[PDB]
Amino acid sequence: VYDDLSKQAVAYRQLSLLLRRPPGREAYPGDVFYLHSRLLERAAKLSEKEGSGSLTALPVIETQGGDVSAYIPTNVISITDGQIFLEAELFYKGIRPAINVGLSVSRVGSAAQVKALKQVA
Amino acid sequence: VYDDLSKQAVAYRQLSLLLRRPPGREAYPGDVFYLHSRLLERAAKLSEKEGSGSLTALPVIETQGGDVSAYIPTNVISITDGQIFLEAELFYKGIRPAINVGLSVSRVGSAAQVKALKQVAGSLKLFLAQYREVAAFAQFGSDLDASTKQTLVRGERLTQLLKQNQYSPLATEEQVPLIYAGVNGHLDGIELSRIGEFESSFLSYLKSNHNELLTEIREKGELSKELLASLKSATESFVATF
Amino acid sequence: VYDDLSKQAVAYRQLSLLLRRPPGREAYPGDVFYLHSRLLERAAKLSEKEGSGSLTALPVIETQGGDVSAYIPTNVISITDGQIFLEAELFYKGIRPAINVGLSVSRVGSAAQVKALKQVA
Amino acid sequence: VFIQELINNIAKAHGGFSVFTGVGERTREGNDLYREMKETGVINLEGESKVALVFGQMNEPPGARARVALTGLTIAEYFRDEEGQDVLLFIDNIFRFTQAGSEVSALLGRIPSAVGYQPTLATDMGLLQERITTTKKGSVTSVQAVYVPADDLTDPAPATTFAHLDATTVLSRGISELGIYPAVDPLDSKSRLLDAAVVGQEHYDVASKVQETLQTYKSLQDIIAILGMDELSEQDKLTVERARKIQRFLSQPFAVAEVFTGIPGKLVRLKDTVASFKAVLEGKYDNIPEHAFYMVGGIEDVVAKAEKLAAE
Amino acid sequence: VFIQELINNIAKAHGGFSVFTGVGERTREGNDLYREMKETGVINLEGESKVALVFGQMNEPPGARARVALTGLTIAEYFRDEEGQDVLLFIDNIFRFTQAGSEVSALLGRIPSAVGYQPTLATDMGLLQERITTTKKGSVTSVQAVYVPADDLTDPAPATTFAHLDATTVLSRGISELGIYPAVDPLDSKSRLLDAAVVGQEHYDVASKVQETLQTYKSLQDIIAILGMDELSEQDKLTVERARKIQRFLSQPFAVAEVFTGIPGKLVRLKDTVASFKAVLEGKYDNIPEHAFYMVGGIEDVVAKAEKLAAE
Amino acid sequence: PITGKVTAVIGAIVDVHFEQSELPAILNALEIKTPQGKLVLEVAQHLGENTVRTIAMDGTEGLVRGEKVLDTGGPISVPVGRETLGRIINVIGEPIDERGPIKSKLRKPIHADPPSFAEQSTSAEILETGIKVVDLLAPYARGGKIGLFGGAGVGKTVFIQELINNIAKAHGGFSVFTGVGERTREGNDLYREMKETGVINLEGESKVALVFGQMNEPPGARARVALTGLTIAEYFRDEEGQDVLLFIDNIFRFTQAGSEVSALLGRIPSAVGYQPTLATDMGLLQERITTTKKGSVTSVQAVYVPADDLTDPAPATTFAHLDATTVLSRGISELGIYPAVDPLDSKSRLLDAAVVGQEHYDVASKVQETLQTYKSLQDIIAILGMDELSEQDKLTVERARKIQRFLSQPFAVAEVFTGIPGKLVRLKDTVASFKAVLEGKYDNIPEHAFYMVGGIEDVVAKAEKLAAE
Amino acid sequence: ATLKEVEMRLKSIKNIEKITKTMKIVASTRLSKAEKAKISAKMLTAMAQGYAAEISARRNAMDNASKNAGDMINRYSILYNRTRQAVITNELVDIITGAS
Ligand SMILES: CCC[C@H](O)[C@@H](C)C(=O)NC/C=C\C[C@@H](C)[C@@H](O)[C@H](C)[C@@H]1C/C=C\C[C@H](C)[C@H](O)Cc2cc(OC)cc(O)c2C(=O)O1
Ligand SMILES: Nc1ncnc2c1ncn2[C@@H]1O[C@H](COP(=O)(O)OP(=O)(O)OP(=O)(O)O)[C@@H](O)[C@H]1O
Ligand SMILES: Nc1ncnc2c1ncn2[C@@H]1O[C@H](COP(=O)(O)OP(=O)(O)OP(=O)(O)O)[C@@H](O)[C@H]1O
């Protein structure tokens, strides 16, 4: 679990400015994508020849005002095989964990769902 | 025709940044206005002393997101003598070639307009301006006043007349009879879907039956009062048949 | 009376940008607040040990479109001890001197009002 | 998903060699594509294969992502020129070629342009993108996914890429959030081939009337929001209803979408599409509910689904 | 004015010491605070004093306005760790520390972040703001005012500060222009402690129903602006009338600001507040005019004022 | 002489090295003899190592390093006095009308200090324009700056030509017109119009001198053409003792050219791209336009507003200088009221009883109230119909339409195509005429007796002739 | 707000203001018809008065709505100008800081 990748991106923006590298979009450095992508591509399921091991990643992103269109949110959405989207309206209406069932989707975990739970759901 | 001055400005920005010249408002150099004004001021009409030749320019600009206030659009709008604005909203409402007549304006060419066409278009521009003001009544066309109803009828028929198929330009002898019929109101009784079929049918009627009329319009370039009477009679006869 | 501190701020922006100082908000330099506050802090009422003297200041500001939320207005509002706001709508309605009674306030001068005026107002 | 549907529909029927280039897509999407292509017989390890795969995914340094597209092009160009074939070239996230150029640009020492992109963006892209053309030696059909970095089509990479393409299929987030899949925006997706000389007058007229209907419904959105549909005229009420039918009818289940939609995927022929939308424009089905049009494979499916809801 | 009301209500009720740091605010405000501290008796020049004062006001150079917060914090940390006391640390305008960091950074010649702020803005704030924590040795409460330039809450310094705070109170110019003092935005202000396990279920319920009512009113306010309240449903008309009463009732006369309001100051107990707002949510007082709710110290005062208005 | 080699050439920016170690001062003019004509450089910076940086008044294509430059020993200096009248001059003071040399006795440097504070006139004064709607409702400030607003087709050029004519007739002072970044088409059309109107007369006496800088000129030229025109007007003020007019065909183009020059120099841009010197550049142009002991220069300036955003820094900086504003607008011309001045949106700082006097201020205030009340009712009186109003309000509407027609005037420059003889109406006659109309003394005369007429005596004569008709 | 958001919002409010002014005019024509019916009927007299009253109330409400929309269009025009200026200057500051 990375409880904020956005705070890493802020720290890397600072470090890039101290290295006197020019900022790009939203003043983040241009390779702020490459920073997260080469991180998250390390989460994988290996083949039996590679010993069947696995690493699962749960990156966390802070949206501003729920704006999933912002640069860092959409960058990470373009890497993460899906998202769980947690909605302030549901949360403050007391529906917790407040998972928005429309905007949350798992692109690959439906193959890995428990069969009994798929059958009943 | 400079079929995109925005891509020239982008190429000159590439040059300037790689030559490490200081960037400006959108990293374009400070003299990108000087670039386009130096290009465009070469279009001119010469005097008889200079052989009376002319060069006409049509620059093209791609406004990103319709932003006419971007830097290069602002510069070329300020350098040019007039603007033809095309809109995707109009294009998808089927108004093609999609010219926004409200924004499009020609500072100088109104003096150059063909006199026969100017005689009819003077009414057309007013009827269109009224239609654009009254158009919001079209959503609620019950219990209209007769004046707004008639404004919607003319405005719709004129708008449906101004659309035109790609690669099918019309001679002025073919344009003035159609706009005359539209502005005078001979199309007010015709179903709006038919108006397009009216165009090809009425031209065909004029070309075969009244070729001397179209010839005189073309050769003189102006509609005499005799020619306006003749065109009225021919238009009323066609509509009576149509 | 500083009959336009906005024009002093504009002159300081010119001087700072010709010095290649980094532009900040509205391209004003970051220390434009320090420019006005070190000025307006010099207006003071001294104690009787210091001879009781005083300097009163009236800075003046132009708000484009009446925007009191602009950068230089909010800076000087944050330095001064109140404001007199003159409303263009009132001035053109012929209400002159056009003091807007809601948006103007004296944050310290209420103790200095003439007591007879305090009584009758 | 749209590219994988196009691969399923075309790349097995194409009858000529193909190249797929992943440029900064996921390594997982490449492994899934390779499994699919290996099981659908497009790749036969003990036989003949019809597709070549080139990958430079988002784990790779920017120097690699800036050059893998040229490798894919070079293989496709060898098939076009040397074999003389008709070749089908897929590129996933060609935007990643442009972005990697920006990532190196500042280290090369270039002054960044409008929003930090390299100055050479338009000419680097034009040098890449002009090799993909069809020639007298042979044809290349090319399908390219273009990422849009904040859903803004005015970003210099999308905006420049639009100038290079014969057909543009703008997908939009809003339409996908309405659950309309494949989420193609019926307006601002466009093609050079939509000519009555090419599609025929009947197709051109149906597509035109569809786009006028959808633009009308898009215009009425303000008064439907503030004043409600009760303010509309009867002709506007009819147009809004028919536009909402057409808008759902453009939705379609794909086979890969069967995992996400639960509905078996369907292919709709072009003639069947034109006939179906013509009949809907004729008002032939103004009595059928809008949901009978959602996720169906043509107007026969609309009628069958309407019968199913009526039986329910 | 809010900080001075908090100082009056809390600071002499608090059992331990206090520290006040003025960073880049008016030297007048510091002299008035020092006089008010002597008059109230939190400072005795011939006796024991409960508060230490540290000042580096807006007349000071940027280096001093940058470092003075660290002096105040070092004194607070000494009381927390060495004395073991519970401290409350006030910092009037911590934004002036951040802005001073930008000013020196501009002279240092670093490449700026965002709207010209220094790089290290985030780590600068972290190094200051992490020292303020409570520890096992002693508690440190702190109340920090944060100026917001041009009222832009998106400004990097506010947005950086929001990450560090357990409770945030947002004061809105629009609310203050309505004459609703203390100008707190009821929806943007939030707290970690608004948890039914902490406040109790009754308080959490009342707060949630107030927030939902005000959010509904905010959602209506542009329809109401165009069409007036008559276009609303009866449920909406009731919800908006009660939302107006509620937001008007969140106003309160502060004792330090009676010079500006004429009404003497009120303290309202927490229990009395929760009972008052629950009784308002029950509709029990829907017959009372909105003016009776404005600028009063709880529901018994609302009833007294309503009686005075009805007699008048 | 002081002479130096070219050492760098980067667009419009040229660096020159003066190995004589006597560098030209900033703003000095240097000249290069190109194969055609000459190229003038204005010095902008001293770089060190005997090297100056300069901005080019003409295209730099064909320059070589080691090209030879002469220091002319001062700023750009332009011919002045009578010889300028009726002639077209470029930024560097060459004739571009092809009528040969200007052969004036004097040249004056285009960079000069404003009059000192002791030199300033201590009180405001009205320049009577001879135009009723201006002289009543937005009086022009003698020695002041006046902004001119509106689109195309509103009649700006005929209004400007009538201002030139009226000030030449009533005050004897000449005019200068400077076109800054103008369209060369529109400059040609202006020169032709001015010859047809006869304010330029190639065989006779000309009333206006013309200065032009073209969009195709480099930004340094477009930036300096305003100073050339100002320097000619200043010479007529300082040494003929005249009350001069100076027309600036767009002051926004001057701002924009200064912004381009600043960007090419490599200065950091400011509020929204404009040069950081925007305010001091404008102040250095504008506050040379003033009254002195010898005379005045009054300036009429055409204020383009970049996006109709009156809050844009170039408008906001210009507006600080304007003493009056005249709005020409399409609607007033659609009623057929020429000169199409908007009588309510036009305003003057000098319309105050101390400057004008109480009688003028009262008449103008009553006119403004009458027109504003008529415009406020004009929608509801159309909704209810003209009878659906108080007889007092209906009477004020009769006055308002009669006054609104009375604000039309026949211009003598118009006479060449309108045919009706033009008339110049004095300020006192205008005030008296509108007072008498506001007193109701002519409530019986029909409103069309007030259209296109030169005062109330002419209103009476027109009513008598039209009644005899 | 981003410049396109405030531009789209402003365009929508201008559209609504035209719509409500036209609904005002249509209500005035319906009010002339209702006045004719009201006088001719002077239960039928009840509906003729109630109809004339409803049409007059709709005309008044649409006048108020158009005036409110006009004021909101003024406010959004000012916010649009300020957002345009802020965007231009912030992007140019970002370009300059990238060039440094
Ligand atoms: C340029 C920046 C502007 C900036 O946005 C503004 C905040 C600023 O900078 N300075 C103004 C600060 C304080 C002045 C107030 C004390 C007070 O003088 C005025 C009149 C306010 C005006 C507000 C509403 C009127 C309404 C009838 C109210 O209800 C009146 C009212 C009644 C009341 O009952 C005792 C108590 C009150 O405080 C108020 C009230 O707030 O009115
Ligand atoms: N045609 C479709 N039918 C059903 N669901 C779809 C369809 N297209 C997309 N989706 C949904 O959208 C999700 C994302 O699809 P996809 O991976 O094709 O997106 P993308 O544009 O390539 O995204 P990225 O930028 O992350 O690569 C899919 O997992 C599925 O949930
Ligand atoms: N609760 C309140 N009751 C009455 N008046 C108040 C209240 N809060 C603020 N005001 C009034 O609003 C203004 C508040 O000034 P104050 O010094 O508290 O503001 P601030 O946010 O600290 O400003 P600055 O940025 O200048 O430091 C004064 O006019 C005060 O009269």
mmCIF file of N, CA and C in Angstrom, chain A residues 10 14 17-18 20 27 91-92 94 96, chain E residues 109 111-113 119-120 122-123 190 204:
data_model
loop_
_atom_site.group_PDB
_atom_site.id
_atom_site.type_symbol
_atom_site.label_atom_id
_atom_site.label_comp_id
_atom_site.label_asym_id
_atom_site.label_seq_id
_atom_site.Cartn_x
_atom_site.Cartn_y
_atom_site.Cartn_z
ATOM 1 N N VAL A 10 4.698 15.276 -5.125
ATOM 2 C CA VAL A 10 5.082 16.585 -4.587
ATOM 3 C C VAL A 10 6.552 16.618 -4.171
ATOM 4 N N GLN A 14 9.520 18.960 -5.874
ATOM 5 C CA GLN A 14 10.499 19.734 -5.115
ATOM 6 C C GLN A 14 11.929 19.357 -5.490
ATOM 7 N N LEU A 17 12.898 20.676 -8.884
ATOM 8 C CA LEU A 17 13.178 22.110 -8.865
ATOM 9 C C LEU A 17 14.531 22.405 -8.234
ATOM 10 N N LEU A 18 14.898 21.665 -7.188
ATOM 11 C CA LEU A 18 16.212 21.861 -6.583
ATOM 12 C C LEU A 18 17.334 21.396 -7.503
ATOM 13 N N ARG A 20 17.132 22.050 -10.493
ATOM 14 C CA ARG A 20 16.972 23.026 -11.571
ATOM 15 C C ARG A 20 16.535 22.376 -12.882
ATOM 16 N N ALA A 27 2.895 22.165 -13.246
ATOM 17 C CA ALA A 27 4.213 22.359 -12.649
ATOM 18 C C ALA A 27 4.880 21.082 -12.149
ATOM 19 N N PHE A 91 -19.752 9.153 1.798
ATOM 20 C CA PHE A 91 -19.095 9.073 3.100
ATOM 21 C C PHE A 91 -19.763 9.974 4.134
ATOM 22 N N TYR A 92 -20.019 11.232 3.778
ATOM 23 C CA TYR A 92 -20.678 12.162 4.688
ATOM 24 C C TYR A 92 -22.173 11.917 4.823
ATOM 25 N N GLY A 94 -22.875 9.002 5.482
ATOM 26 C CA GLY A 94 -22.738 7.880 6.387
ATOM 27 C C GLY A 94 -22.770 6.517 5.737
ATOM 28 N N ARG A 96 -20.515 4.182 4.598
ATOM 29 C CA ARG A 96 -19.101 3.860 4.682
ATOM 30 C C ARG A 96 -18.904 2.365 4.507
ATOM 31 N N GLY E 109 17.886 32.802 -5.287
ATOM 32 C CA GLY E 109 17.993 32.450 -6.688
ATOM 33 C C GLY E 109 17.628 31.022 -7.019
ATOM 34 N N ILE E 111 14.885 28.230 -8.405
ATOM 35 C CA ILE E 111 13.783 28.241 -9.362
ATOM 36 C C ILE E 111 12.486 28.075 -8.576
ATOM 37 N N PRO E 112 11.531 28.993 -8.724
ATOM 38 C CA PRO E 112 10.319 28.944 -7.904
ATOM 39 C C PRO E 112 9.381 27.807 -8.269
ATOM 40 N N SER E 113 8.643 27.360 -7.259
ATOM 41 C CA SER E 113 7.473 26.512 -7.417
ATOM 42 C C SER E 113 6.213 27.351 -7.601
ATOM 43 N N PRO E 119 10.826 26.452 -3.848
ATOM 44 C CA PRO E 119 10.947 25.020 -3.581
ATOM 45 C C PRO E 119 11.381 24.789 -2.141
ATOM 46 N N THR E 120 11.075 23.602 -1.623
ATOM 47 C CA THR E 120 11.110 23.290 -0.189
ATOM 48 C C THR E 120 9.931 23.879 0.573
ATOM 49 N N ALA E 122 6.988 22.613 0.841
ATOM 50 C CA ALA E 122 6.384 21.493 1.553
ATOM 51 C C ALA E 122 7.261 21.004 2.700
ATOM 52 N N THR E 123 8.564 20.841 2.466
ATOM 53 C CA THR E 123 9.443 20.421 3.556
ATOM 54 C C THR E 123 9.677 21.528 4.579
ATOM 55 N N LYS E 190 -14.160 21.541 8.755
ATOM 56 C CA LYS E 190 -14.247 20.116 9.040
ATOM 57 C C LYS E 190 -13.331 19.790 10.210
ATOM 58 N N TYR E 204 -23.380 13.858 16.479
ATOM 59 C CA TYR E 204 -23.086 13.493 15.096
ATOM 60 C C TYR E 204 -24.325 13.549 14.208
#
